[PDB]
Design an enzyme around this catalytic site. Structure first.
Site, PDB file in Angstrom:
ATOM      1  N   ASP A   1       0.536   3.658   1.768  1.00 13.14           N
ATOM      2  CA  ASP A   1       0.563   4.130   3.163  1.00 13.14           C
ATOM      3  C   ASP A   1       1.945   4.434   3.776  1.00 13.14           C
ATOM      4  O   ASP A   1       2.859   3.596   3.772  1.00 13.14           O
ATOM      5  CB  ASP A   1      -0.192   3.134   4.064  1.00 13.14           C
ATOM      6  CG  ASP A   1      -0.401   3.665   5.484  1.00 13.14           C
ATOM      7  OD1 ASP A   1       0.556   3.631   6.261  1.00 13.14           O
ATOM      8  OD2 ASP A   1      -1.507   4.117   5.811  1.00 13.14           O
TER       9      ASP A   1
ATOM     10  N   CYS B   1      -5.628  -0.053   7.161  1.00 13.08           N
ATOM     11  CA  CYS B   1      -5.665   0.411   5.760  1.00 13.08           C
ATOM     12  C   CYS B   1      -6.902   1.211   5.359  1.00 13.08           C
ATOM     13  O   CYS B   1      -7.974   0.678   5.165  1.00 13.08           O
ATOM     14  CB  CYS B   1      -5.414  -0.720   4.728  1.00 13.08           C
ATOM     15  SG  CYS B   1      -5.498  -0.031   2.973  1.00 13.08           S
TER      16      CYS B   1
ATOM     17  N   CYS C   1       0.807  -1.197   0.000  1.00 10.21           N
ATOM     18  CA  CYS C   1       0.000   0.000   0.000  1.00 10.21           C
ATOM     19  C   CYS C   1       0.842   1.249   0.000  1.00 10.21           C
ATOM     20  O   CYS C   1       1.958   1.268   0.562  1.00 10.21           O
ATOM     21  CB  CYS C   1      -0.976   0.001   1.192  1.00 10.21           C
ATOM     22  SG  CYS C   1      -2.126   1.410   1.162  1.00 10.21           S
TER      23      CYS C   1
ATOM     24  N   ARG D   1       3.168   4.350   6.647  1.00  7.43           N
ATOM     25  CA  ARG D   1       3.725   3.532   7.710  1.00  7.43           C
ATOM     26  C   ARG D   1       4.337   2.228   7.184  1.00  7.43           C
ATOM     27  O   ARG D   1       4.760   1.351   7.988  1.00  7.43           O
ATOM     28  CB  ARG D   1       2.675   3.247   8.764  1.00  7.43           C
ATOM     29  CG  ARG D   1       2.065   4.522   9.290  1.00  7.43           C
ATOM     30  CD  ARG D   1       0.740   4.266   9.934  1.00  7.43           C
ATOM     31  NE  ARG D   1      -0.376   4.146   9.003  1.00  7.43           N
ATOM     32  CZ  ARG D   1      -1.607   3.801   9.374  1.00  7.43           C
ATOM     33  NH1 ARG D   1      -1.881   3.522  10.655  1.00  7.43           N
ATOM     34  NH2 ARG D   1      -2.563   3.722   8.477  1.00  7.43           N
TER      35      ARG D   1
ATOM     36  N   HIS E   1      -2.100  -4.269   4.922  1.00  7.26           N
ATOM     37  CA  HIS E   1      -1.777  -3.784   6.257  1.00  7.26           C
ATOM     38  C   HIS E   1      -3.030  -3.371   7.036  1.00  7.26           C
ATOM     39  O   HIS E   1      -3.900  -2.625   6.525  1.00  7.26           O
ATOM     40  CB  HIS E   1      -0.829  -2.599   6.203  1.00  7.26           C
ATOM     41  CG  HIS E   1      -1.453  -1.376   5.647  1.00  7.26           C
ATOM     42  ND1 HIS E   1      -2.086  -0.447   6.432  1.00  7.26           N
ATOM     43  CD2 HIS E   1      -1.594  -0.945   4.370  1.00  7.26           C
ATOM     44  CE1 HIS E   1      -2.562   0.521   5.665  1.00  7.26           C
ATOM     45  NE2 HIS E   1      -2.268   0.248   4.409  1.00  7.26           N
TER      46      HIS E   1
HETATM   47 ZN    ZN Z   1      -3.462   1.234   3.045  1.00  6.77          ZN
END
Ligand code: ZN
Ligand code: CL
Ligand code: CL
Ligand code: ZN
Ligand code: ZN
Ligand code: ZN
Lengths: 222, 222, 222, 222
Positions: free
Chosen positions: A44, A101, A42, A46, A98
């Site tokens: 994302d 998400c 992703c 993190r 994850h």
């Molecule tokens: Zn995500």
């Protein structure tokens, strides 16, 4: 302000120390790469593949998008896929979702009338969502979230195995494994969701959906 | 062989070590993110932004694709752009090329007829190239390649600046900067290739193509 | 109301009369097609390929989209292209634009911050627009419109000739011609904008942009 | 041979003949359009909507593609949908399959590994097929093919109904109907396959997949 100097300084200091510790650190990959892994995960903030797997440059080629989605019809993703399988000859494909998400949450709750492109983009989550009414309904907002993240992983793993790239690669004896995994932003940890899939026989055993039938449909008629 | 514990073990160590260096490393992001940067870079195994900028989780949102391409019509990249600018309100877009980029070389060397999806996907690179035919005409193989990488970063900065998401953010007085950076895999070093762009003004001063004219083209009709 | 009966009745009456006039009218194409033409034109309601060219079913395979755009990266269009060249083996590709084209006007006047998908979609018109600042500036709103429509035709014709499908087709001796034409909603008429292009040699002579250099770029270096 | 006057001549005749049958045929659309229908159909040479519905210009906006597919993520089709629903305010969406559709057969027979863009593009067809494996299991080649065409039309009606553009139009009390029709190339005949859908209610009654549940899925979480 918009000045980059503390960012670049931070970079410098990082590259300084890596070369200090190992002199060929960068130079070995100055003119080429030979990664073993492709990672699809992703976008994302993190979830930094190299950091979480403690990898050095040259190890893991990376596609990252909102929801870690894989579609035959997405040239962005399919390009990372084609290139690493056909040209770089990677061995392992990590499909990584994850917890926490957003794309999975959005996929659960939004109303398709929502405006913008993110909502166009996550239509694949809705599709997975729709096939699993039964695993999701009457689950707490939070468990549904977690479930949805996992179902997505599993759906994306299927998509990777059904991709023409992976399928052509299997048809020619090229060893290619595909792996469904998940990451916890709050713990730094990665659990395996689906054991390694190394060809059809494996997928047959390890995937809920039927890849064989997908591949050979007409064998399912008269 | 496709086992995965090795890796899985490396993940463990890493996560314990980080949890050792800092108790609330992961935990402070368990249920949110507030990164300041969106990064758009090559999917190339040598170029992991959080790593190269020595960022911890929650700091950089990442789109990664073959050739760090940005197009209004690619919903993959566009949704990373929309979700970061609009929901997350990031402040800085990093657009990062890298030297020794296969996509940039492929855009110089391949014949459009090559087959596969990669070749389709890197059509944007050829377009940057055709537009700068003269800058590239004459240079050595090695020189051209490097020049392509740089023209591509500039072109992709322009495309982020021209995207609906960014123009709309700028017209809404959102603070938002866009940066052209390149990275040298053989050194771990990032170099600023285009000074920070924080609005039309910056961009009129700093870019080789006319953003103002792109944004207001009809004003120059009779 | 939403009832279809006058639509279906109208269909019926039409099919009735065609079979009446020629009995094999439909039946010859009941189980197959062998069209000679592929037509790429605008989704616009005033522009019905078969009607304007007075064609009967089986003659012209049709892609229609907003702006009659052709892009290597659009699987919708590229599918109509691949299928008709590789499988149906068509002979002629008609790239057709039309005066009064909204997509061309929108391409001229809109501000890229405009919301929605149509605006994502017409980014190709803006690209053609940007390369021709010189043919467009200080022209009347109306002449600019007409010019923009024509430049688009010519750009799309180039895109068709540069497409991997057409290029692979040329490389294997398959006869394939490509044609830039334009339609006037207010008159029912079609003028030829670019004479027939039947391979490289022709394109070299007939297209402003340099297809040879596009195809063989590295031949333009050292 | 690639000359074009023949054709060009046929266009002339046609346009004079129509201008003979009616003096303001073309002229009344010179500078606008107000069609009531958007049509989404196969790019198949046998299936020209304005012709088969005996419509004159200005009456039907046309998206045509390989397999009459509708996806939120295809900006080609989506922009035909947005521009007709929003700018033009059409009243009726016709979603039209046709028997003897190669895309539908290809979605039954091809192995996902087949190469090319068509195969990528018709991934949606395989998905409709996998979702209805049981309805198709057992039937003869000929029967399956016909059944695919019909499941596809229904699936594409659902996708138009579920699209952001349509849900948004419905929530805005726009009058807008969606129709599942199929066409028999061997006869010139259109048959209504799904009664008119004018809103959620219609769709809850008429569609095999649950639109309400697609639109409000999270309401069924704990
Ligand atoms: Zn995500
Ligand atoms: Cl990364
Ligand atoms: Cl048509
Ligand atoms: Zn690269
Ligand atoms: Zn038009
Ligand atoms: Zn068809």
């Amino acid at each position: 302000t918009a000045d980059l100097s503390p960012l670049l300084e931070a970079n410098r200091k990082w590259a300084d120390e890596c070369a200090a510790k190992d002199s060929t650190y960068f130079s070995k990959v100055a003119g080429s790469q030979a990664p073993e892994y492709l990672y699809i995960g992703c976008a994302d903030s993190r979830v930094s593949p190299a950091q979480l797997f403690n990898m050095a440059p040259g190890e893991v080629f990376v596609q990252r998008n909102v929801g870690n989605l894989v579609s035959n019809k997405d040239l962005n993703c399919m390009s990372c896929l084609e290139y690493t399988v056909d040209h770089l000859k990677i061995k392992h494909i990590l499909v990584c979702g994850h917890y926490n998400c957003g794309a999975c949450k959005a996929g659960l709750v939004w109303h398709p009338k929502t405006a913008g492109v993110t909502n166009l983009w996550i239509s694949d989550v809705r599709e997975v969502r729709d096939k699993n009414a039964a695993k999701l309904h009457g689950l707490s907002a939070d468990d549904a979230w977690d479930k949805m993240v996992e179902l997505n992983v599993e759906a994306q793993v299927f998509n990777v195995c059904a991709s023409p790239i992976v399928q052509a690669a299997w048809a020619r004896g090229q060893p290619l494994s595909v792996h469904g995994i998940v990451y916890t932003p709050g713990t730094g940890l990665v659990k395996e969701l689906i054991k390694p899939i190394t060809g059809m026989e494996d997928a047959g055993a390890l995937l809920r959906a039927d890849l064989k039938q997908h591949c050979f449909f007409s064998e399912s008629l008269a």
